mmCIF file of C-alpha atoms in Angstrom:
data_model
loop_
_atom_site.group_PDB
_atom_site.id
_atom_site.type_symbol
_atom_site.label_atom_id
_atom_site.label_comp_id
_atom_site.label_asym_id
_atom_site.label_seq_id
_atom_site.Cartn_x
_atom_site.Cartn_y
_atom_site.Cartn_z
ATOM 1 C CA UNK E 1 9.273 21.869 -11.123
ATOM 2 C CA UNK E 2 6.031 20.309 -9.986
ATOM 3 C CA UNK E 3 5.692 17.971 -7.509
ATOM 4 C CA UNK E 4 4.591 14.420 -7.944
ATOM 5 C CA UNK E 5 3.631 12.437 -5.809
ATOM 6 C CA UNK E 6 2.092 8.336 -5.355
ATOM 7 C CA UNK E 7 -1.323 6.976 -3.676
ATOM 8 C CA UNK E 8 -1.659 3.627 -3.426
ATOM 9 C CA UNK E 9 -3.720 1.293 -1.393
ATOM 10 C CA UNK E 10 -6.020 3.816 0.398
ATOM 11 C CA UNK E 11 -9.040 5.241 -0.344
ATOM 12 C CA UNK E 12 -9.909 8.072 -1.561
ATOM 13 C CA UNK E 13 -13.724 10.326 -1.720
ATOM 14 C CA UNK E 14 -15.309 13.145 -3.785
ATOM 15 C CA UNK E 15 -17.556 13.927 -1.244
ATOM 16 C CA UNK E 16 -14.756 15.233 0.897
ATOM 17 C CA UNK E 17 -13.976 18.238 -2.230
ATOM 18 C CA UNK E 18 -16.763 20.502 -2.394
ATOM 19 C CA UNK E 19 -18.134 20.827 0.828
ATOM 20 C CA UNK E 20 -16.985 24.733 1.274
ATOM 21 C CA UNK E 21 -13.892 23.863 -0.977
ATOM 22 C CA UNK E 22 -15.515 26.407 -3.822
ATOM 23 C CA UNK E 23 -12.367 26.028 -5.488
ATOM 24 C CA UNK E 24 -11.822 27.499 -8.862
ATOM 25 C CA UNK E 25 -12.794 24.996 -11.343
ATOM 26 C CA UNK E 26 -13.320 20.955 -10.736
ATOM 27 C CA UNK E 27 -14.462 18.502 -14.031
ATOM 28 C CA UNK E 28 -13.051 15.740 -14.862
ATOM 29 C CA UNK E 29 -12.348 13.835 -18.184
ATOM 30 C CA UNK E 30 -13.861 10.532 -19.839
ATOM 31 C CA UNK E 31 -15.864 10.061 -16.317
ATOM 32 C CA UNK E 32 -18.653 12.254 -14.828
ATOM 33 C CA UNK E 33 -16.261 13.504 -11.616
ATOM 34 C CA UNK E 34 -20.200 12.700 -9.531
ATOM 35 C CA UNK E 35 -19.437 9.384 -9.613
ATOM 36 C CA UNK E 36 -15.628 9.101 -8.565
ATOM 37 C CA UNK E 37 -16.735 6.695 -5.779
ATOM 38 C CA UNK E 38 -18.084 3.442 -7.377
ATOM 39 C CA UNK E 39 -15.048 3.639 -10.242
ATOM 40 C CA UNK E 40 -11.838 1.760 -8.992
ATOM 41 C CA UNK E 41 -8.598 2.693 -10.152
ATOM 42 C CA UNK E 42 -5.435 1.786 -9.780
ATOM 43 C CA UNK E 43 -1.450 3.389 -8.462
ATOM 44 C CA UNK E 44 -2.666 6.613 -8.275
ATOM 45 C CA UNK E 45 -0.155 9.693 -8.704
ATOM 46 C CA UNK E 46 -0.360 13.284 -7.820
ATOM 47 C CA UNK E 47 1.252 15.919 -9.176
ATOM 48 C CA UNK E 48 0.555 19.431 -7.712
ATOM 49 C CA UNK J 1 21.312 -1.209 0.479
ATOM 50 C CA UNK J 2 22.463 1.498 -0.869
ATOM 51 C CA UNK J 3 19.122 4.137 -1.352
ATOM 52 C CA UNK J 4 15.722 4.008 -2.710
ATOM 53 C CA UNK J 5 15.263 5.924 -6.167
ATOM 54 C CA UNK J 6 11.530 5.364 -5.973
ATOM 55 C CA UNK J 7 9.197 3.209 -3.796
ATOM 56 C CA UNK J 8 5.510 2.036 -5.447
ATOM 57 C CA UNK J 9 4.456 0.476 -1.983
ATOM 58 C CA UNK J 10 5.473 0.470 1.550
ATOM 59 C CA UNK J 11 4.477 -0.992 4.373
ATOM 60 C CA UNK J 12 4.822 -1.994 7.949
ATOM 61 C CA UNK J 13 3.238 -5.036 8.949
ATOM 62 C CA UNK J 14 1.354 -6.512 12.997
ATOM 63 C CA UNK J 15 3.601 -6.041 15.940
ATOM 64 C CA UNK J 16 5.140 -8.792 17.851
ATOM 65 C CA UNK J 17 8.022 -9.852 19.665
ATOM 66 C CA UNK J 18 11.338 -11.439 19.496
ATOM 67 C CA UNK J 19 13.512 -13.438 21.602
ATOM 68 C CA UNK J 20 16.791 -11.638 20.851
ATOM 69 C CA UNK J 21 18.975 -14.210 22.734
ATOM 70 C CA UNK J 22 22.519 -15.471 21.569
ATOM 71 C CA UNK J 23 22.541 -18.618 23.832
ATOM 72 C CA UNK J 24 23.861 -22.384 22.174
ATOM 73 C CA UNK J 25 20.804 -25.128 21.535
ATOM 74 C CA UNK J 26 19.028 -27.029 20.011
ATOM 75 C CA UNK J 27 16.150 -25.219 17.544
ATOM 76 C CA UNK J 28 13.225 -24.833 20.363
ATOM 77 C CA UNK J 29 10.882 -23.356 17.405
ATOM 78 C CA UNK J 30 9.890 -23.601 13.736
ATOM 79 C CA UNK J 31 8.618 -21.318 10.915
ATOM 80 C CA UNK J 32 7.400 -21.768 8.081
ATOM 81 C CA UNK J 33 6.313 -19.626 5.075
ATOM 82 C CA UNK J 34 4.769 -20.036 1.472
ATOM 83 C CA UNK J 35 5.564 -16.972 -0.970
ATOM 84 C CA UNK J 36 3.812 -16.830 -4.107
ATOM 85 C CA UNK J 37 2.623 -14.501 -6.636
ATOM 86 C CA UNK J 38 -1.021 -14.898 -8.668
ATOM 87 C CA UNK J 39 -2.424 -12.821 -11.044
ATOM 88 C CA UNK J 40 -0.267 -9.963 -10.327
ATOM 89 C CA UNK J 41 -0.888 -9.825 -6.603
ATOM 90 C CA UNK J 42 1.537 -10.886 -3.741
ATOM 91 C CA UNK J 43 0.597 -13.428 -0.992
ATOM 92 C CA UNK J 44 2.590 -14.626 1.939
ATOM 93 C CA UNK J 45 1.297 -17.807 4.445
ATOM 94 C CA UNK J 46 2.944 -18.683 7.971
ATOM 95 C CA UNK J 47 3.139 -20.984 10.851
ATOM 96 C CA UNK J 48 4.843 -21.478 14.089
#
C-alpha cells in the first residue's frame, strides 16, 4: 500500500542526497544519477 | 463541486484586494482577460 505522491513545477537537486545521507544504495537507470541537474523532466511522481 | 479525485497542479496566485460592496451604479471599472492555450501550456493576459 505504497504511497504515491506528485511534484510538479519546483525544482529539485542531487546535491542535496549524499551529503551525510549514506543511504543504502542510490543509481539510477538510462542516466548517470551525477548529472540529475542539467536533465529536465517533466510531472514528476513519488512513490515511497 | 463536489471533491477532487486527483489534482496535477495547484496554485494560488498575487494578493490583492476587493471592493466587496453591494451598492446600485453604474460599472465604475473594467476587466479584461485573454485565455489561451499554445503548445500545451496555459496563458492568461489582464487589464483594468
Amino acid at each position: 500500500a505504497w504511497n504515491r505522491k506528485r511534484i510538479s513545477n519546483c525544482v529539485a537537486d542531487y546535491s542535496v542526497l549524499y551529503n551525510s545521507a549514506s543511504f543504502s544504495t542510490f543509481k539510477c537507470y538510462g542516466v548517470s544519477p551525477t548529472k540529475l541537474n542539467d536533465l529536465c523532466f517533466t510531472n514528476v511522481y513519488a512513490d515511497s | 463541486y463536489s471533491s477532487a479525485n486527483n489534482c496535477t497542479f495547484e496554485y494560488v496566485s498575487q494578493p490583492f484586494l476587493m471592493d466587496l460592496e453591494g451598492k446600485q451604479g453604474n460599472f465604475k471599472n473594467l476587466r479584461e482577460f485573454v485565455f489561451k492555450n499554445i503548445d500545451g501550456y496555459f496563458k492568461i493576459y489582464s487589464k483594468h
